C-alpha cells in the first residue's frame, strides 16, 4: 500500500513523488489523471501516465471521446488504469492558462468523493496554471475520501508542506 506519505488531515496525505512511479509501485484501485476535456494526454501528468501505458490510455480515450464527446471542465470519467491502476479517474480541472474559471476547481475535486481511496495529483496545478497552494486547500476542503497526493516538484512539495494551515 501507500508509504512515506505525510498526513495533512484525517483523509488527505501527501508525498514528493512521481505519480507514474507511485502508481506502478502501489497499483492503486484509482489513479487520477489531470485530464483536459478532449482526453488529449500530451503533457504534465496526463502525458506521463499515457506514456507509461505505452499509449493504451490515449487509444482508449480516443474511443471514449468518439462515443461520448468531450468532458466538461470540472467533470470526470472512469476509464481503465491499464498497467498503472485498476481504474483511471480522468478529472478535468480548470486550466487557468486557457482562461478557465478557477471556481470550477472545487467541482473537479468533488469527483474524488465517488472513490474511497485515490492516488492523485493536485488538480489545475503545474501546466494548468493554478496556484498549487490554493489547489491543496480546495482539495482538503472538498475531498472527504482518502486521497494520496503525489507532488512531483520537490521545491513545490516543500512549500506546500511548510505553508499548510
Ligand atoms: C515548477 C512548478 C511551477 C508551478 C506549479 C507547479 C506545480 O503545481 N506542479 C505540480 C507537481 O509538481 O506535482 C510546479
From Swiss-Prot:
Activity regulation summary: Inhibited in vitro by GRL-0617.
Domain annotation Macro: ranges: 1-165
Topology with respect to the bilayer: Multi-pass membrane protein
UniProt catalytic activity: Thiol-dependent hydrolysis of ester, thioester, amide, peptide and isopeptide bonds formed by the C-terminal Gly of ubiquitin (a 76-residue protein attached to proteins as an intracellular targeting signal)
Localization in the cell: Host endoplasmic reticulum membrane
Subunit description: May form homohexamers. Interacts with N protein.
General function of this protein: Responsible for the cleavages located at the N-terminus of the replicase polyprotein. Participates together with nsp4 in the assembly of virally-induced cytoplasmic double-membrane vesicles necessary for viral replication. Antagonizes innate immune induction of type I interferon by blocking the phosphorylation, dimerization and subsequent nuclear translocation of host IRF3. Also prevents host NF-kappa-B signaling. In addition, PL-PRO possesses a deubiquitinating/deISGylating activity and processes both 'Lys-48'- and 'Lys-63'-linked polyubiquitin chains from cellular substrates.
Protein name: Papain-like protease nsp3
Origin species: Severe acute respiratory syndrome coronavirus 2
Organismal lineage: Viruses, Riboviria, Orthornavirae, Pisuviricota, Pisoniviricetes
Gene symbol of the encoding locus: rep
Amino acid at each position: 500500500s501507500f508509504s512515506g506519505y505525510l498526513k495533512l488531515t484525517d483523509n488527505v496525505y501527501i508525498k514528493n513523488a512521481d505519480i507514474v512511479e507511485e502508481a506502478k509501485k502501489v497499483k492503486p484501485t484509482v489513479v487520477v489523471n489531470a485530464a483536459n476535456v478532449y482526453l488529449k494526454h500530451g503533457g504534465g501528468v496526463a502525458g506521463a501516465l499515457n506514456k507509461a501505458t505505452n499509449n493504451a490510455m490515449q487509444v482508449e480515450s480516443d474511443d471514449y471521446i468518439a462515443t461520448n464527446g468531450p468532458l466538461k471542465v470540472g467533470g470526470s470519467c472512469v476509464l481503465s488504469g491499464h498497467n498503472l491502476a485498476k481504474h483511471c479517474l480522468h478529472v478535468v480541472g480548470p486550466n487557468v492558462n486557457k482562461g478557465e474559471d478557477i471556481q470550477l476547481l472545487k467541482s473537479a475535486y468533488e469527483n474524488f468523493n465517488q472513490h474511497e481511496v485515490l492516488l492523485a495529483p493536485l488538480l489545475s496545478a503545474g501546466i494548468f496554471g493554478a496556484d498549487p497552494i490554493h489547489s491543496l486547500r480546495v482539495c482538503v476542503d472538498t475531498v472527504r475520501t482518502n486521497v494520496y497526493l503525489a507532488v512531483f516538484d520537490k521545491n513545490l512539495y516543500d512549500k506546500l508542506v511548510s505553508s499548510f494551515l
